[PDB]
Subunit: 388 residues, 2 copies
């Protein structure tokens, strides 16, 4: 009657109560400004939606190879060569249910009981939980607003132990929205290569960039970095396809084949017609992406300016993704208390940094309409003035 230890070790969500309160308030018709979303507000581009409907009509509703539709594995490989300078072939990629499964399959393929996985904080909520489902030991590397929430190569080097099996490297970042410069990624890749450790490069937000920030896949830092790294990414953020559940793992054939064995004995191939939508996302014009990015840039401008004019905060300027992760340390309140109080007092929903391993910060998403942002930021400022 006892559950496996691996699942018992998974931590319960820290945002259960605040999420329920927000839900209930909305059910009552209370005017809430929400900045908790972890997905774009845009609809999936029409041509991607149409491709999927066409595949459905064409009968693309049967089983397919576990590694994914050959046409999509090819499109992905070509995209990685063209955009990221990564020399991959179709044999190097595995189609998964979102970037999440890509990461999950990598963990089960590489992490054995006892292995340590270095995870810089703040971190995407699922990272340590996934490491634990694979029976590994999460090694959290804390960062500060003073360091732009970035881990240094020396910080990584110090955390390496004979048990260290993997380094999780997410840029641009959720929840900070911070972007490691190409020189910074090259410097991090250098430490990894020297210590001979594998790197999981989570590049899901690669296209959501601002102020001419530049994205460099860590695997493109050098041929040695390429040999010990895998790309975990997908179509969710670039194309507002969060609900499609289509992503991929790209790396050395040996690893990919092992990850593919796992895919075949867990979920089998990814939804066939959903894969066709992803084919269209890469095979067609990227105009939709730039149009969406432009709206984001406009929202970012507004929220950043507002946040910068508020007392009691410290927000490092983010150049990627669609999040702001300001420090609320000056308020002397923990993230749970701060966000719960802000919601109750001013009806503004934000995510406590505690969920990402940073109790003195909060996450806001500007992936919502400008009017919600303007009104919400006004309420937030008023809240800060009332508690300092």
């Amino acid at each position: 009657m006892k559950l496996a230890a691996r699942v018992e070790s998974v931590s319960p969500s820290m945002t259960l109560i605040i999420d329920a309160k927000a839900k209930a308030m909305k059910a009552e018709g209370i005017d809430v400004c929400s900045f908790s979303a972890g997905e774009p507000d845009f609809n999936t581009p029409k041509h991607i939606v149409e491709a999927a409907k066409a595949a459905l009509e064409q009968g693309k509703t049967r089983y397919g190879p576990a590694a994914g539709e050959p046409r999509l594995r090819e499109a992905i490989a070509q995209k990685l060569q063209r955009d990221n300078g990564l020399c991959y072939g179709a044999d190097n990629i595995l189609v998964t249910n979102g970037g999440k499964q890509s990461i999950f399959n990598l963990m089960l393929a590489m992490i054995e009981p006892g292995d340590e996985v270095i995870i810089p904080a703040p971190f995407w909520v699922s990272y340590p939980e996934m490491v634990k489902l694979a029976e590994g030991t999460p090694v959290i590397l804390p960062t500060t607003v003073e360091t732009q929430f970035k881990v240094s190569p020396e910080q990584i080097r110090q955390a390496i132990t004979p048990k260290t099996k993997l380094l999780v490297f997410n840029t641009p970042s959720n929840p900070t929205g911070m972007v490691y410069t190409p020189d910074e990624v090259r410097a991090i890749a250098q430490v990894a290569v020297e210590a001979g450790l594998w790197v999981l490069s989570d590049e899901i937000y690669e296209k959501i960039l601002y102020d001419d920030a530049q994205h460099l896949s860590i695997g493109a830092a050098s041929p040695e970095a390429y040999e010990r790294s895998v790309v975990c990414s997908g179509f969710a953020k670039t194309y507002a396809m969060t609900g499609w559940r289509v992503g991929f793992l790209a790396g050395p054939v040996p690893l990919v084949k092992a990850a593919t064995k796992i895919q075949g004995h867990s979920t089998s191939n990814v939804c066939t017609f959903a894969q066709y939508g992803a084919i269209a996302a890469y095979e067609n014009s990227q105009d939709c992406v730039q149009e969406m990015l432009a709206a984001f840039a406009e929202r970012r401008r507004y929220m950043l300016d507002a946040l910068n004019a508020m007392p009691g905060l410290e927000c490092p300027k983010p150049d990627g993704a669609f999040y702001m992760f300001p420090s609320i340390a000056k308020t002397g309140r923990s993230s749970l208390d701060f966000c719960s109080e802000l919601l109750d007092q001013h009806q503004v929903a934000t995510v406590p940094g505690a969920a990402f391993g940073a109790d003195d910060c909060i996450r806001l998403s500007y992936a919502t309409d400008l009017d919600t942002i303007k009104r919400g930021m006004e309420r937030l400022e008023k809240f800060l003035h009332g508690i300092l």
Copy 2:
């Protein structure tokens, strides 16, 4: 360099050489009579496809609850009450990527290193591999043509040890097409109940029955069995939705919640619009099912008689699914050899029984048109004659 022990323990497929070759042969102009498919030939019913297209058009493309869409979880619970006499509510349901992920999540939730899992042979190929991915130890129970390829409760009792944690029970069965009668299901249920052993009830083929055979969910055998059993099923076979990847886990709330946590940290929710199609499958008329079933019953009758009139083969009568699993023992050959030459020499595709733990048999699938069946059965007879 070194992959986790869990994935290195997963055996390589010995079927993708045929099931995939027959395809390559078909695509090359060669007239192949394929009886190797593990999915129906029928297209997904129109109303289900339309329901999915409508969802896509309506923007059901965002993240959703890890447990699945509330409407689908409710439609599933109702279906289980109405069809299988199970009293599940929505809280007992977890929407997964096919019945395969339902089984996978269950394994990860309750199977730990050292745990033993009893698996009746011939078994669905993935069962032992999934047990091993959860680091468990499979305990395979051999059956013979004499026992109609069905295990007896005494055989199960004899195999139970203090390390036994689970019994995998699949009926109707893949690859045998055999159906355990309600009395047999009740008998097996009581051995499990007496031992306080949990039962994984793989009921995916529950609707595909013949000669008025009857399907009884193990959990409906008694309140005690209902307490320690779970249903792993889906829409794949009943509605020709194999490529949709929509299935479910149904069981006690505590277990379902644990499986849901794993779902949340592995793949997240199941493709949102694909789920809306599953809703249409259960909410609408079941005429599509009876029609396909009718076409299946006609093909079965023909293949069954053709097989029964073939000396050198012994095939118990299958009353479920769309498979036949005749013994080729008389030929004194291994299924790998037999199936290999049959394809090479007569362009007839069948799956080696060795894949399912029974090298002295072969699986035939009659999920194809009648003309292909009569032609293929004539080629099979000739082949047999040549080696007997």
